[PDB]
Amino acid sequence: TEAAKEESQQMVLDIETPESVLLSAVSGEDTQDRTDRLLLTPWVKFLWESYRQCLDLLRNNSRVERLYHDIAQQAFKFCLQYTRKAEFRKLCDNLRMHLSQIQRHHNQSTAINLNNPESQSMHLETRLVQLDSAISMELWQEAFKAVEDIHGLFSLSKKPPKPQLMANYYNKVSTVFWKSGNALFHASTLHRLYHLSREMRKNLTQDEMQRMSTRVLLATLSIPITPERTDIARLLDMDGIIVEKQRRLATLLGLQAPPTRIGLINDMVRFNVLQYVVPEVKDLYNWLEVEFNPLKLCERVTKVLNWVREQPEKEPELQQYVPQLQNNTIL
Amino acid sequence: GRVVRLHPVILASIVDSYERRNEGAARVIGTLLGTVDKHSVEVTNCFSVPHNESEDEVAVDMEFAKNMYELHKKVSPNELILGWYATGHDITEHSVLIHEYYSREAPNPIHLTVDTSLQNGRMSIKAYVSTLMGVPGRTMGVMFTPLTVKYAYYDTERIGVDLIMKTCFSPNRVIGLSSDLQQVGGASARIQDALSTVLQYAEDVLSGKVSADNTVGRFLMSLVNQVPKIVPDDFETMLNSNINDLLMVTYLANLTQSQIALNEKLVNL
Amino acid sequence: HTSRTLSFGSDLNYATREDAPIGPHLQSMPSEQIRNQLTAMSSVLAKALEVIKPAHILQEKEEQHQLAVTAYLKNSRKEHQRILARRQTIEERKER
Amino acid sequence: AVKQVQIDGLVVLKIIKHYQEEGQGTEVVQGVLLGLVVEDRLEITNCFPFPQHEVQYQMEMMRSLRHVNIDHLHVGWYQSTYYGSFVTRALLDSQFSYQHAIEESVVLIYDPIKTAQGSLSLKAYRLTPKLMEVCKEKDFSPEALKKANITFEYMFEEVPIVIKNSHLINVLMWELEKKSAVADKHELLSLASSNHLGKNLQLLMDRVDEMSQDIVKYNTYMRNTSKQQQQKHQYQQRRQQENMQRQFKPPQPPARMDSLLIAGQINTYCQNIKEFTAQNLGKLFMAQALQEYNN
């Protein structure tokens, strides 16, 4: 395939007008995109087939499984480069075809032990690169379908998983909630994440403790205080659907309750996380949440945020919360 | 915990279990469920459990006592054991030996001392605990470390007990379950008695009764200052249009229900 | 916008909703204060019932205390002897 | 029937205790009720509630109530609901289950929000015998519905409640009231509720739209039968002219127990929102006396 991309690539250099103007009127297509369909794309259909046969023949064994688990993460590297969009859905369906057949066929001498923690830890390596690459391919429902399949494995294995897997697992679900327009659920993974990342490395630093604890307040003070839309739920004849469809979204995260902002800012001054904070952002609970100083909040709380806009290169990780606190300031 | 927070659902459940007894024994052993913040010991629900009464012997049924903890565990899992009550302000040799049973199950057991009556007193309730240490030969001296029991009310509890409060201003302890606008008019009677106390002292505190003037003086001025001021032309646009709204739903619900009824005169043919 | 002026409050028709933030707090606007004004008479007068310590209604309290605590000791063992007969009334009604 | 229901104090405070701890957002939570009925008065002294998911749970506790010499005879069952809407087929099915064991049985439907805004709402209602009549013969049929006549005023009759206690509770009522924090009773005279009124009317509007759904199809059932009666009488005049010169399914109606269930449910809106009507209008008109001197 890599040879055939280049031979189609220099064909673009080989070639460089009534036959181009008519075709622009039906579908916009580059001259690269035409020649890829003739030369390259029959091979990537074979290259996609060459992974997909070798999955289904090596499945459900116990002693080949390093080759099975790496052949999925090899194949995700492929569709990242050659942009098979519908074939990402084809890999998802056969993935769950492996999921049902593990449950029934325990009887074989090579049948797989799903309470054994290593083989399930490679399953957490298998499903997480799907979530890692669906970020890279804008299949936002299928990155949501990645996290649906992950939480079943928590109830497939009996023991809870290893810490280092769940460290990046709570990292990624927090990020995908922010890109999907949520800032309520962005903080709810991070409030779960501060509870998680104390006991994998307990004695690590105070600066890494400075790294983790500052972000959850800026996840909670970048919650918009004005609530979600229920005018569009009123106009479209679906009422009450937002006290629905979050108990799905809470109980697929690992917690069970719908998060709310009085209930979320309370549970970080509860643990005294503000002992472990940057002292420039220590006084944010004082100004914005407690004290009645209605002339003073314009200059004071922006002075905190102009420390944030000093360093987008030293501390880049708070910089997504730079417009979202300002929406709180006007109200 | 240094302060217990009881709830008044316990106390009538003591008394209704005090009135239905085996004849002649004094006490009802039974255990309690509730929660803790380690300055506030909350205790939320209660049961009765019998025991066998004898000389130097009270025989507690350790298969029955574990059962009602498990039976209420099906109701909720979230309630730990904080202690047991025992009736009377008197402590016989029975009451020490029961308290050491529940310390093998081991909370610090948070005990309550309930009367039937102090004879020239009143119901006098106190909050006890047992904790001590031993000298090996004779370790049999022990006393009760007492703490304060104070009740707590919630908003449906404090609106619910007010009608259970009205049992007392009644001859044979009956009020039939009350109407709304007689209770609106009773709220004016609640005002009319409470107005009477400050006004009767007002002709006292005008003329001579001025010694502790300022503590009632600071409160009567703030009562008149906490209520804000409109000229009454602003009020009738609020009041009488809301009256035109409430009279509207009186017609409209009767617009509906007469057509519920005249549909019902159509479908019952 | 005619004199470029904002007005906070000043609308006495407004029925308040449940889902507001109660944040950093002051005396509210009068649409939250013309409503809930019968409560302020109802709250502070019964707090003013203390600060007098009025001496005539205290004696009606304690005579109502003394008669009630002695109504128990007069009416004792007359309900418990009927509830035992009510206890036997279960064991003839349930068999009925 | 039962003319009077009466409470001892223990049933109500444990009825609050299943609202106060156990379910908080909106939960249907439910129990049994207890007591003996001395003649013409249903005396309630106890309850014990059921969690949110049975007879084995119900019957095992009956030995427990006998162990301490407490009254153990099941009379009825209570249930918590939302603002005015408790009327469902499921509780009425679970009520005639207990109307069958003992001839007197009850719902005291405890609504925790109507207490927190105002007056005490326990709704102690009992079954009318004519609605006991239709289920014993098990004819949910419109032809016997008119002979065994059910129209919506005797759909749930109401039994009035009178509070009863011993005098040691009156000691303990006198004991508590002195020794306490001063809890002012102000929450009755609140004088702003328009979403307590709003969801009262909005839950009414979907059932009248459910009632609008029921009689729009009732046109269509008549539009089904008015064609088919004339089509078969066309087939009467078709087939009777045929044999002189030589010498099918009727539809069911909408099944009429739901049309009576919606009117009795709209009967629950009609009594309460008009009792809600002068409830706020009384505190509006006492507030006319509050502004009355202020110039």
Q: Assess contact for D207 and B255: CB atoms under 8 A.
A: no
Q: Tell the residue number behind the tokens 């994998």, with chain if given.
A: A200
Q: Assess contact for A32 and A60: CB atoms under 8 A.
A: no
Alpha-carbon gap, residue B175 to B171, rounded angstroms: 10
Pick from D45, D163, D180: which is nearest to B151 by CB?
D180
Query: C60: which 2 tokens?
Result: 């009606």
Alpha-carbon gap, residue B78 to B69, rounded angstroms: 12
B163 touches chain D (CB under 8 A): yes
Alpha-carbon gap, residue D10 to D22, rounded angstroms: 18
Question: Is A225 close to C21, i.e. CB distance below 8 A?
Answer: yes
Vertex D155 angle, CA D149 and D156, to 5°: 145
Alpha-carbon gap, residue C24 to D54, rounded angstroms: 49
Query: B88: which 2 tokens?
Result: 């009377």
Alpha-carbon gap, residue D123 to A56, rounded angstroms: 63
Neighbours of D279 (CB within 10 A): 24
C88 touches chain B (CB under 8 A): no
Strands B126-129 and B80-87: unpaired
What lies within 8 Å, CB to CB, of C41 at 6+ separation is B191, B223, B227, D290
DSSP, collapsed to helix, strand or coil, labels residue D7 as: strand
Contacts of C23 in chain A (CB under 8 A): 289
| Type of residue at D242 | E
Which residues make beta-bridge pairs with D46?
A: D34
Q: Write out residues 49-78 of D within 8 Å (CB-CB) of B.
A: 49, 51, 57, 60-61, 64, 67-70
How close does chain A come to C34, measured CA to CA in Å? 23
Q: Of D43, D57, D46, D39, which is closest to residue D15 (Cα–Cα)?
A: D46
Alpha-carbon gap, residue D28 to D79, rounded angstroms: 6
Alpha-carbon gap, residue D194 to D198, rounded angstroms: 5
Query: B135: which 2 tokens?
Result: 């000298």
| Type of residue at B18 | Y
For residue D290, report the phi and psi dihedrals to the nearest 5 degrees: -80, -35
List of chains touching A (3+ CB pairs within 8 A): C
Question: Is B230 close to C44, i.e. CB distance below 8 A?
Answer: no
Give pairs for A101-109: CB < 8 Å, separation 24+.
Answer: A101/A59, A101/A60, A102/A60, A102/A156, A103/A156, A105/A60, A108/A60
Q: Is B126 exposed, middle or buried (0-12, 13-18, 19+ CB in 10 A)?
A: middle
| Type of residue at D144 | A
Query: D145: which 2 tokens?
Result: 């519905």
Alpha-carbon gap, residue A208 to A203, rounded angstroms: 10
D144 touches chain B (CB under 8 A): no
Query: A42: which 2 tokens?
Result: 């029959």
Vertex A37 angle, CA A33 and A39, to 5°: 110
Q: Assess contact for D170 and B165: CB atoms under 8 A.
A: no
Q: Tell the residue number behind the tokens 């009736």, with chain if given.
A: B87
Vertex B233 angle, CA B231 and B234, to 5°: 75
Task: Give the best residue of C38, C44, C58 to mutate against chain D (max D CB count within 10 A).
Answer: C38
Q: Residue C10, by phi and psi: left (phi above 0), alpha (psi -120 to 50) or beta?
A: left
Angstrom CA distances, B85 to A106, B60, B139, stand at 55, 14, 25
How close does chain D come to C72, measured CA to CA in Å? 5
- The 8-class DSSP code of residue A62 comes to S
List of chains touching B (3+ CB pairs within 8 A): C, D
C73 touches chain D (CB under 8 A): no
Vertex B31 angle, CA B26 and B34, to 5°: 140
Q: What is the resolution of this structure in A?
A: 3.8
Residue-wise DSSP of B156-184 = HHHHHHHHHHTTSSSTTS--BPPPSHHHH
Strands D41-44 and D5-7: parallel
Strand segments (E) across chain B: 3-6, 30-34, 40-42, 52-54, 57-59, 80-87, 110-114, 126-129, 148-151
Q: Assess contact for D47 and B202: CB atoms under 8 A.
A: no
C8 touches chain D (CB under 8 A): no
Q: Of A40, A21, A121, which is closest to residue A82 (Cα–Cα)?
A: A40
Contacts of C77 in chain D (CB under 8 A): none
For residue B42, report the phi and psi dihedrals to the nearest 5 degrees: -95, 140
Q: How many whole angstroms from its chain centre is CA D17?
A: 21
How close does chain B come to D198, measured CA to CA in Å? 11
Q: Assess contact for D170 and B168: CB atoms under 8 A.
A: yes
Residue-wise DSSP of A105-167 = ---STT---TTSHHHHHHHHHHHHHHHHHHHHHT-HHHHHHHHHHHHHHHHHSSS---HHHHH
* Closest Cα in chain C to D184: C43
| Type of residue at B268 | N
DSSP, collapsed to helix, strand or coil, labels residue D157 as: strand
Query: D23: which 2 tokens?
Result: 């379910």
Q: How many whole angstroms from its chain centre is CA A303?
A: 32
A22 touches chain C (CB under 8 A): no
Question: Is C12 close to B228, i.e. CB distance below 8 A?
Answer: no
Q: Of B47, B65, B49, which is closest to residue B9 (Cα–Cα)?
A: B47
Alpha-carbon gap, residue D95 to D99, rounded angstroms: 6
Pick from B197, B223, B230: which is nearest to C49 by CB?
B197
| Method by which this entry was solved | cryo-EM
Which residues make beta-bridge pairs with B87?
A: B114
Pick from D12, D14, D64: which is nearest to B164 by CB?
D12
Q: Tell the residue number behind the tokens 């049933």, with chain if given.
A: D11
Pick from C48, C57, C65: which is nearest to B220 by CB?
C48
Q: Is D143 exposed, middle or buried (0-12, 13-18, 19+ CB in 10 A)?
A: exposed
Alpha-carbon gap, residue A187 to A264, rounded angstroms: 8
Task: Put the strands of the sheet holding D161-163 in their side by side order.
Answer: D37-38, D41-44, D5-7, D161-163
Query: A257: which 2 tokens?
Result: 């309750």
Alpha-carbon gap, residue A255 to B69, rounded angstroms: 28
Q: Reduce the secondary structure of chain C to three states and give it as a string.
A: CCCCCCCCCCCCCCCCCCCCCCCCCCCCCCCCCCCCCHHHHHHHHHHHHHHHCCHHHHHHHHHHHHHHHHHHHHCCCCCHHHHHHHHHHHHHHCCC
Question: Is C93 close to D191, i.e. CB distance below 8 A?
Answer: no
Question: Is D168 close to C94, i.e. CB distance below 8 A?
Answer: no
Question: Is D168 close to C87, i.e. CB distance below 8 A?
Answer: no
Pick from B20, B68, B123: which is nearest to D172 by CB?
B123
DSSP, collapsed to helix, strand or coil, labels residue B18 as: helix
Vertex D96 angle, CA D95 and D100, to 5°: 125
Q: Of D150, D173, A209, which is closest to residue B162 (Cα–Cα)?
A: D173
